[PDB]
Amino acid sequence: SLQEKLLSYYRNRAAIPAGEQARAKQAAVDICAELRSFLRAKLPDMPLRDMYLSGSLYDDLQVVTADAIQLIVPLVLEQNLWSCIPGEDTIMNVPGFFLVRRENPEYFPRGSSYWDRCVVGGYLSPKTVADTFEKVVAGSINWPAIGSLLDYVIRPAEALTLEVQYEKDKHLVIDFLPSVTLGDTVLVARPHRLAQYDNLWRLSLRPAETARLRALDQADSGCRSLCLKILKAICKSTPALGHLTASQLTNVILHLAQEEADWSPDMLADRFLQALRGLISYLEAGVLPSALNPKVNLFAELTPQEIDELGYTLYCSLSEPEVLLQT
Amino acid sequence: SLQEKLLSYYRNRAAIPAGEQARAKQAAVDICAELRSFLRAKLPDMPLRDMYLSGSLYDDLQVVTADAIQLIVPLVLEQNLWSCIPGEDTIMNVPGFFLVRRENPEYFPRGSSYWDRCVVGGYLSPKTVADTFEKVVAGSINWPAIGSLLDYVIRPAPPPEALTLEVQYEKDKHLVIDFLPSVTLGDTVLVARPHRLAQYDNLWRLSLRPAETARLRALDQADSGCRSLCLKILKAICKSTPALGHLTASQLTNVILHLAQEEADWSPDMLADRFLQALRGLISYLEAGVLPSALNPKVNLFAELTPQEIDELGYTLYCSLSEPEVLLQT
Helix, strand or coil: CHHHHHHHHHHHHHCCCHHHHHHHHHHHHHHHHHHHHHHHHHCCCCCECCCEEECCCCCCCCCCCCCEEEEEEEECCCCCCEEEEEHHHCCCCCCCEEEEEECCCCCCCCCCCHHHHHEECCEECHHHHHHHHHHHCHHHCCHHHHHHHCCCEEEECCCCEEEEEEECCEEEEEEEEEEEEECCEEEECCCCCCHHHCCCEEECCHHHHHHHHHHHHHCCCCCHHHHHHHHHHHHHHCHHHCCCCHHHHHHHHHHHHHHCCCCCHHHHHHHHHHHHHHHHHHHHHCCCECCCCCCCECCCCCCHHHHHHHHHHHHCCCCCHHHHHCC | CHHHHHHHHHHHHHCCCHHHHHHHHHHHHHHHHHHHHHHHCCCCCCCECCCEEECCCCCCCCCCCCCEEEEEEEECCCCCCEEEEEHHHCCCCCCCEEEEEECCCCCCCCCCCHHHHHEECCEECHHHHHHHHHHHHHHHCCHHHHHHHHCCEEEECCCCCCCEEEEEEECCEEEEEEEEEEEEECCEEEECCCCCCHHHCCCEEECCHHHHHHHHHHHHHHHCCCHHHHHHHHHHHHHHCHHHCCCCHHHHHHHHHHHHHHCCCCCHHHHHHHHHHHHHHHHHHHHHCCCECCCCCCCECCCCCCHHHHHHHHHHHHHHHCCHHHHCCC
16 A cells, blocks of 8 residues: 555655764764854854754754755844845845845945945845855864864865765765844845846745644644655655755645645555645646745746656656655 | 871862762753753844853862852954953053953944944943843843753842852752853953952953863873862862852962972872962962962952952961861861
8 A cells, every 4th residue: 555655665765764863963063063162263253153053954854864954154244234125026026035235334334344345236245155154164174183083074075065974874964054134034145046146145944844844743743744754755766856855845745734634644645645746736837836935936946857857757656656665 | 197188078078979060060051052042043133152151060170069150151242343452551450351442433333333332431341241141132031931941940130130040950959150241352352250349340351260271171181180189179178168268269270270380290199298389379379469370470360359358368378277177177
């Protein structure tokens, strides 16, 4: 039965071994601690809060292997010197992306904020911030030595990413993610795929999506997360489905969760099939709205050939969904 | 025999029982972790880094009972807008302290920096920074909620203040956590720990304890020496003797550091001799009225004591030479 194949596939393929998960998290934590001592000693005058770990691995949503985690690099912006402008209120009209504008330049001249050194054309550039960060922070750390202290080999790559070998044949990729918060709005420097939109900060969706997902299950107590992890593992293991993202898949689950309230254990097979059908529907329309930010098309960064290959692969699977479940 | 009396005194009076030490420190660690998680998502415009633990209890040098630890609150002062002026170069004329000045107040007007709200007369007031921290940071924290979460009873001190936390980590064991706002300019680390006298209340304190403690531990680590043991015994005597209460962990640490500069042999059998030298040394510093910081010789660690308090301590120590049973009770 499909139900059995899904249950066993989660344990056999999607679930990360406990030892591997613990060692990957410990390595992330040790490295996070090292940046903290580094910032304290070397950058006392840069308005940046401490870096901290974030992501699927931490949220127990990572699958197959523990291979990635984010280190958020939280810039401090003066609330009276900066504002954010929603991409849909601009002429570029890019929902889910924001400009960060330098305010009051007549009264507060350049130098009134540390981050003025990353302003281009009156906007805090996410590209220059990212560059600034690597040159001032990332390139200033003796990774080989720190790697020697712990028993990891650490290798800077994708220049804002670290490869950390925490086991034989197991590596964790840590990416540094510059971030700003203005009022209630959290923005990250994760560039749009299109370089013409490269002064645009990305609205941070993942923490709220993960929160809502955890909330939905914690009261059920349902198999949404279980279904999501199976989907993530499938896409990660199937080269033609690799373009789908953890966030896209979470949103497919979130939209399905608004149309179906029963996620009891035995419903996993049906929901799984519904998730496949929802994905096809979104792919054909070329539109997958963010469940929490309806203006935002999460498929807006996929290319025609990608949407086509994705659509085709799922179609070919409809009659025999179990073929996606290779383990 | 002095050797035996000292080892006995350490075991029976100075040493904190392992369970008490472990639970007290773990409580401070738990609280620190929870504040870190809670505060990271708050106060997005405040240049505030993660709070971190500091002090004797954290460095395994606290004696008699686990009763206190510091939470350092590291604040970021921007490049270019701030400078520090050594206290000896101010009219205050006091080493070991600094004024922090807001640079270029006109070209980069008031309001350019988060900390401009804490500036008084063009200087960053450590008292005003402490105030902002209490109102804005501490005041955003739900203490009953954190305590309920970790199964601790955490009670904030009422104003005034300063805001310290009374932590019952198990019925009935207590620890006090004090918050220490801190800024760093270049390689000068300053803390908001006010001079004893109000006319000097505009001055930040030069942080000395971490480097002192690191040197002591490095020395003992290299030769398995008894410098820390001798320090802990001295600390317990001073803590257990009311007339000696004005002596601080730091003052005593520097007595041991100065002695370590004069004596290389701190093998276990030398404890008694080193203890006597430390004691005679302490008396000599009191007599000169000056105990220089081993790491910053310009700084007189007795500068906040009155001449009368200094005389009284010297006198007390002299009288104790003939009363060893009182000095070593219990």
